[PDB]
Amino acid sequence: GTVNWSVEDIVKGINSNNLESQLQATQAARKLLSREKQPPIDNIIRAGLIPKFVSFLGKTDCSPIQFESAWALTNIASGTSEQTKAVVDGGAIPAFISLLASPHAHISEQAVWALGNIAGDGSAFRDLVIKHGAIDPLLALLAVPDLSTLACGYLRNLTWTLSNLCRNKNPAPPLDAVEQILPTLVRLLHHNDPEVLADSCWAISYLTDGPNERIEMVVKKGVVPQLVKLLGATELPIVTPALRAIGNIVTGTDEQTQKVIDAGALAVFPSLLTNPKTNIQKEATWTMSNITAGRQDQIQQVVNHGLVPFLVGVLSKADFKTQKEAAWAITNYTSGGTVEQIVYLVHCGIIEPLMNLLSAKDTKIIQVILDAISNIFQAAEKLGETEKLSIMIEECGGLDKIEALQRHENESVYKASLNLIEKYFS
């Protein structure tokens, strides 16, 4: 019936001035644009059909052609930036926002979907969707006493479109738009559907990726305990954005970091730092590196939770980018820690795996490690035990590599190298 029309036939039906003929041709376009392999988006655009689809969105007496054109335009907007731009250039944004009030749930859902693709293109179209007034009718669709009464796919699409309004930077979303959205986001973050939970976590992770004032807006809504709970979920698609959000938060102030610790996050890190998915291990070790960049009482919590042996483990064996985050975690720890905390680090076995990574070709991890070694020597100076540490570095092959590195391309590596040799390996 409407399966496998040519673009030419679709144009012929849409141009016919027969509403039923246009309905059939629009559904045929929708089916073309729904195929997985190379949907002919550019052919449909080039045929001039977008203005016709956009005007079909306004045909209140023919709800099927509203749906079919909404779906067709949704799938054009799912393409490249240029393809999304063609949809926007045709006036689709206010027409889709009007459709959010449709009494037909499947049509308002399709308009939700299309706006998420438009907003998802980037900051400018995101902000353009916001300027046309999308946030109020979107949030009104969720203004029910219990989210559980909404259809499952409908709630998932709303959550995802809201997360695209929270997404992207340069610039970040408008402050007042974020404040308007956050209470609904908090509510979606406590819903029981794993996809809603994943996309809510993604939205929170976007909002916390920025300056401390952005983080504070989120942290002040009291969501950190729920994020920490989600950090322990069995579903990787929930854990991943929950961990990104938690990691983003601990790039903030010491006080924002303390809320993550107060909520119990560190008890999850034995699992996260040994997680089979290397991206989780990396994100978790980066998070740890920013926590060890904190106050001594926060470093002490890392100690109390037994997490220093887990950092030794990741330093000893992990994919290289995780190992580099572990090196950063160690230099931050030795930079801000007490003498006792640094002594404890050595007793846990940090020295040998630290030395082994001096074989890495990455110039910055060598700098990070040399700094850590200098920081540890400075603690051993305060104890008169430099010699015991030099022997430790020498027995594990480390002095061989610190002596090699004084003939290194980067001048700051060469300098840090010879300084270590002069003062501690005379």
Binding site: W71, G79, T84
Partner: peptide, 6 residues
């Protein structure tokens, strides 16, 4: 970031 329907 973007989702094609069906």
């Amino acid at each position: 970031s973007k989702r094609q329907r069906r």
